[PDB]
Design a protein around this ligand. Structure first.
Ligand SMILES: *C/C=C(C)/C=C/C=C(C)/C=C/C1=C(C)CCCC1(C)C
Length: 137
């Protein structure tokens, strides 16, 4: 696998529906959908160690993890969580998250490198799956 690269979003499906499950009110959902269309992802992968920078026009976040080791990040709506990433196949990984405080929908994400060279990210809250597709810059 080589997830390493600079990725630009080409498609974003069901993101508003995900935010709605997560309690985000309608105007903020619409503005977040617009922000998501400018999403860029930078990945550096060394073996099972990942550095990931996700950004939009006015915001940027760095995610560092090693597969199989718990780390801390935030859910989509912005709540701190404990995350754990495992491989599901050669080029797909899945992250399960657990809220640090309180309760809420069950969230997770997946990252996949397809044969055709796309990066597919999925983000899930309960029953609702958002799918985002990227290509290399
Ligand atoms: C491997 C790639 C990952 C884990 C990407 C995660 C992406 C996000 C947490 C994106 C979040 C965003 C929002 C919550 C609001 C709209 C802007 C986004 C898409 C950057």
């Amino acid at each position: 696998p080589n997830f390493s690269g600079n990725w630009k979003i080409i498609r974003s499906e069901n993101f508003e529906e995900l935010l709605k499950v997560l309690g985000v009110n309608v105007m903020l959902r619409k503005i977040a959908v617009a922000a998501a269309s400018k999403q860029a992802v930078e990945i550096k992968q060394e073996g099972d160690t990942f550095y990931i920078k996700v950004s939009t026009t006015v915001y940027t976040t760095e995610i560092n993890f090693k597969v199989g080791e718990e780390f801390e990040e935030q859910t989509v709506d912005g709540r701190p969580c404990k995350s754990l990433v495992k491989w599901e196949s050669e080029n797909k990984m899945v992250c399960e998250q657990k809220l640090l405080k309180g309760e809420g929908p069950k969230t997770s994400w997946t990252k996949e490198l397809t044969n055709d060279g796309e990066l597919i990210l999925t983000m899930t809250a309960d029953d609702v799956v958002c799918t985002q597709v990227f290509v290399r810059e």
